[PDB]
């Protein structure tokens, strides 16, 4: 890397690793449309396997950015509309609380208080129907935002219904393959297991457990190289040859709702750039319910934004942020779930220095 990039990254990340006791970390900086990679420590402590540019990390809730873009691509294809009732794609969802709940509400966590987690007891398609049928909203649709796997997860599942494809096949064919993300997986193949980092929770090696709507909400594993490519694709969607994918990326960075200084996209969240970390900061909170104002109609992707998404699984902590107007971005992947504020601080320190 240019020494400036080398220096800010190492001087920021080394102390972070030390203070958070992170076993293994990979970082990519995207600078004027080129990636620079950095790696530290261990993918597998017991087997002494180092983190490399090929190591797979669990993305946790950064997976939702892929779901949002896949949804955008389905909109661009004319397969679904965000204004469509949920019941259009799930006619068995007959309970009257669903009247007025649209795909937009599911995608943006504004359906009226869908829970953070789909319960463990929910496995089958029958169990899932019963869960959503029995759910009672605290609020009218489109009044409050409550971050929820059960919300964008259902959006993901319904968005692919018209295609006839499984969610995984849709994601592979319509997003991973066109973008050449050849080492990004919803299910890690046996051939790739050599590269799959262990996550660490209280010193114990752990991988994410299967769950209902996992693929849609938190199911992606990827390398630092592919995630750099994902950030490039989201920085510069006009470089993408596939027309509906190009439009889908754009739709996912549209601003649909505002709360405080933040705007909700599809998966992606955005603030106006410039911004300081304390406002970006503003999972220690298990549940934060926030009133939202509708942006009517949605503002197309603003180039002067800090666009970002935090992710966690039991054993992993990921962070991605980019600023389109500066052609600048960062991906931080770690095999420990360490505090979100420390991620934003480090990312901002790096990006502010290169900006």
- CA angle centred on 212, ends 312 and 207, rounded to 5°: 40
Is residue 61 a known part of a binding site?
A: yes
How far apart (Å, rounded) are the C-alpha atoms in residues 44 and 47? 6
Whether the CB-CB separation of 289 and 277 falls below 8 Å is answered with: no
Determine whether the annotation assigns residue 117 to a binding site.
yes
Any binding-site annotation on 340? no
Q: Where are the domains of the chain?
A: 1-355
Nearest to 347 by CA among 326, 324, 320: 320
What resolution in angstrom units was achieved for this structure?
1.8
Distances (CA, A) of 318 to 22, 125, 130, 170, 309: 12, 30, 33, 24, 8
Residue 175 token pair: 């997003």
Choosing from 61, 163, 233, 305, the catalytic residue is 61
Residue with token string 């299910």: 187
Catalytic residue check, 61: yes
Sequence-distant (≥ 6) Cβ neighbours of residue 37 within 8 angstroms: 26, 27, 28, 53, 224, 225, 228
| Residues ≥6 apart with Cβ < 8 Å to 19 | 342
140 marked among binding-site residues: no
The verdict on whether residue 349 carries a ligand-binding annotation is: no
The answer to whether the CB of 307 falls within 8 A of the CB of 68 is no
What is the second-level CATH architecture of the domain 1-355?
A: 3-Layer(aba) Sandwich (3.40)
| 65 and 71 Cβ atoms separated by less than 8 Å | no
**Helices (H), ranges, 253-294:** 277-281
As given in the structure block, the two tokens for residue 214 are 């996992």
Give the three-state DSSP class for 347. Answer: helix
* 119: nearest Cα among 106, 130, 109: 130
Report which DSSP code applies to 265. Answer: -
H-helix or E-strand spanning residue 296: strand 293-299
Approach to solving = X-ray
In this structure, what are the phi and psi dihedrals at residue 89, rounded to the nearest 5 degrees?
Answer: -105, -10
- Is 337 labeled as ligand-binding? yes
């Amino acid at each position: 890397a240019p020494q400036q990039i080398n220096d800010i990254v190492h001087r920021t990340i080394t102390p972070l690793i030390e203070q958070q006791k992170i076993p293994g970390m990979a970082v990519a900086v995207i600078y004027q449309g080129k990636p620079y990679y950095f790696t530290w420590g261990y993918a597998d402590i017991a087997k002494k396997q180092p983190v490399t540019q090929q190591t797979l990390f669990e993305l946790g809730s950064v997976s939702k950015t892929f779901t949002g873009v896949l949804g955008g691509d389905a909109i661009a294809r004319g397969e679904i509309k965000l204004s469509d009732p949920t019941t259009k794609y799930w006619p068995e969802l007959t309970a009257k609380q669903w009247n007025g709940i649209t795909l937009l509400h599911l995608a943006t966590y504004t359906a009226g208080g869908l829970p953070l987690q789909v319960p463990d007891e929910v496995k089958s398609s029958s169990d899932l129907l019963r869960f959503y049928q029995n759910w009672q909203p605290a609020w009218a649709p489109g009044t409050q935002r409550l971050y929820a796997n059960s919300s964008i997860g259902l959006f993901g599942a319904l968005a692919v219904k018209p295609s006839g494809l499984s969610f995984e096949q849709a994601m592979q064919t319509r997003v991973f393959q066109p973008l050449k993300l050849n080492h990004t997986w919803i299910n890690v193949p046996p051939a790739e297991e050599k590269n799959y980092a262990w996550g660490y929770r209280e010193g114990k090696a752990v991988h994410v457990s299967p769950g209902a709507l996992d693929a849609e909400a938190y199911g992606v594993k990827s390398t630092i190289e592919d995630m750099a490519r994902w950030v490039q694709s989201n920085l510069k969607p006009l470089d993408i040859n596939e027309k509906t994918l190009q439009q889908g990326i754009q739709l996912a960075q549209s601003r649909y709702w505002q709360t405080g200084d933040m705007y909700q996209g599809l998966g992606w969240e955005m603030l106006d750039w410039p911004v300081n970390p304390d406002s970006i900061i503003n999972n220690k909170i298990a549940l934060a319910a926030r009133p939202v104002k509708a942006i009517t109609p949605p503002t197309p992707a603003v180039r002067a934004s800090w666009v970002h998404k935090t992710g966690a699984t039991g054993g992993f902590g990921s962070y991605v942020a980019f600023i389109p107007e500066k052609e600048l971005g960062i991906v931080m992947l770690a095999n420990k779930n360490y505090p979100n504020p420390a991620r934003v601080d480090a990312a901002w320190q790096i990006l502010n220095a290169l900006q």
